[PDB]
Structure 1
Amino acid sequence: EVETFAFQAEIAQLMSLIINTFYSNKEIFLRELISNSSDALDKIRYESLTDPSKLDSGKELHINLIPNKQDRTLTIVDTGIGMTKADLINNLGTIAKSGTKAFMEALQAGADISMIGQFGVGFYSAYLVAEKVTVITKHNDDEQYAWESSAGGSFTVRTDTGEPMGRGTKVILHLKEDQTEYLEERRIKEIVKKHSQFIGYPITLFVEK
């Protein structure tokens, strides 16, 4: 069972702008997704402070970066709070409708696309480098789901049958054919050092055979 949903008009517009605007500083997508992961980890940590059983689904709080050159994917995994089905449908737990409005107002007042994260919609910077994004997620209060979109106005949600995650979110970037630099270890390390050097959770860059 696969359910298909339309993006709200403002999010469709945001996604089209990210896809079609000329903007060379694409590397900021990784900073934005690592920042989202850190926020998600903060949230489950905060809940655990009064209810330790919130971490029964996994005590380790971390961020993994996984490139796969055969599949042409870069995956960002975190063990944060995850998303419920309702969260996924509601723009992956963001205030994306109003955040988009603020972002577009900022752009007309001179802001840069790199400032997307200041408006709560940094997730959508994934489409600077990905033709399709798959999000696998597990929240303590719900089952494991896969969200997916190639833009074009719609996303899908389905129950996920893959490897059970325990708790957290996996963002799988199916990269554009000319964006394969983001699979090279040297490039990922450079970006992490430049933009994410002080994130308060361990970031592990996996390597490949």
Structure 2
Amino acid sequence: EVETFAFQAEIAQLMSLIINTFYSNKEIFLRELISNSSDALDKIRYESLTDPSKLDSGKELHINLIPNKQDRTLTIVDTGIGMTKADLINNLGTIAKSGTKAFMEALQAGADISMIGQFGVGFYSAYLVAEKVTVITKHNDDEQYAWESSAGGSFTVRTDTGEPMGRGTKVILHLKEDQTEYLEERRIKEIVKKHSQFIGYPITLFVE
């Protein structure tokens, strides 16, 4: 079964601002998603120091970037801590409400969209380049789920039927028609070098 939910009003407002504002510096979406992955990998790494069995679902801590021109998707995969159903429906949304209000206030005060990560809502920068975002995730304490939203004020959550991940998150960006530059190897390498050169986990850019 597919469950449909309404985003918190502030989040729906944040997504409309990201989709409708004229802002050419869209490339920052990739550093924001890699930062989310890096924070999830730091979390499972730290948890594993007091409970080694937390790595039974996979010892490798890494990030993969996978472009697919046929499907017009850019996927960011990590073997981080993952997210539970509670994280997907409620917990992260609650945390995001306070950051969204502060970010929207900073934008009115003169800040720019690139500062989104300082408010802990950088995941939503995915909507600068994607018309739809699908998030597949598996946390050690829960089942594999698929979250999805094309904005418009709602999102869906379902148990995932696809290939089992072990542990971690996959963020699938269904790119907008005019944002296919983010499927090009040289363009992705350039962005990772500029904004994500010191991430402490191997970043592998897959080729087509």
- SS class of match (1:98): helix
Alpha carbons of structure 1 residues 82 and 51: separation in structure 2 relative to 1, 3 Å = same
Task: Name the CA distance, whole Å, in 2 between partners of 1:91 and 1:130.
Answer: 23
Decide whether aligned partners of structure 1 residues 47 and 93 sit closer, same or farther in structure 2, where only a CA change above 3 A counts.
farther
Q: C-alpha deviations, 1:141-182, integer Å up to 9, x for none? A: 000000000000000000001000000000000000000000
Find the residue that maps to 1:178 and give its secondary structure: helix
Rounded Cα–Cα distance in structure 2 between residues aligned with 1:8 and 1:79: 28
Contact 2:62/2:201 (<8 A) preserved = yes
Q: Is the contact made by 1:130 and 1:176 (CA closer than 8 Å) also made in structure 2?
A: yes
- Find the aligned partners of 1:68 and 1:11 in 2 and give their Cα distance: 29
What TM-score, normalized to structure 2? Answer: 0.98
Query: Contact conserved, 1:83 with 1:93, CA < 8 A, in 2?
Result: no
Residue by residue over 1:54-103, the C-alpha shift from the partner in whole angstroms, topping out at 9 and shown as x without a partner, is 00000000000000000000000000000000000126477110000110
CA RMSD of aligned residues (A): 0.9
1:100/1:121 contact within 8 Å kept: yes
Mark the CA change 1:93 to 1:55 in structure 2 (over 3 Å): closer, same or farther: farther
Return the offset for 1:110. Answer: 1.2
CA distance in 1, matches of 2:87, 2:161: 19
Superposed structure 1 runs of 4+ greater than 3 Å apart: 91-94
The unaligned stretches of length 5 or more in structure 2 are none
TM-score, normalised via structure 1 length: 0.98
**Alpha-carbon distance between aligned partners in 2 of 1:201 and 1:93, rounded to the nearest angstrom:** 27
Distance of 1:94 and 1:66 partners within structure 2: 30
Partners of 1:110 and 1:17 in 2: CA distance: 15
Q: CA deviation at 1:198?
A: 0.3
CA offset at residue 129 of structure 1? Answer: 0.1
SS in 1 for 2:116: helix
**Which shifted more, 194-203 or 100-109?**
100-109
* Contact 1:94/1:121 (<8 A) preserved: no
Q: Offset at 1:105?
A: 1.2
Instruction: Using the TM superposition, give the Cα deviation of residue 15 of structure 1 relative to its aligned residue in structure 2, in angstroms.
Output: 0.2
Q: Name the % identity.
A: 100
The answer (yes or no) to whether the contact 1:147–1:155 under 8 Å persists in 2 is: yes
Q: 3-state DSSP class of the match of 1:70?
A: coil
Q: List per-residue Cα deviations over 1:168-208 (Å, max 9, x = no partner).
A: 00000000000000000000000000000000000000001
Partners of 1:203 and 1:73 lie apart in 2 by: 18
- How far does the alpha carbon of each residue in 1:117-142 deviate from its partner, in whole angstroms, 9 at most, with x for none? 00000000000000000000000000
Q: Deviations over 1:15-52 (max 9, x none)?
A: 00000000000000000000000000000011001000
The Cα shift of 1:108 comes to: 1.4
Compared with structure 1, are the counterparts of its residues 134 and 102 closer, same or farther at alpha carbon in structure 2 (3 Å cutoff)? same
- The number of residue pairs the alignment matches comes to 208
Specify the SS of the correspondent of 2:177.
coil
Q: Does 1:162 align with 2:162?
A: yes
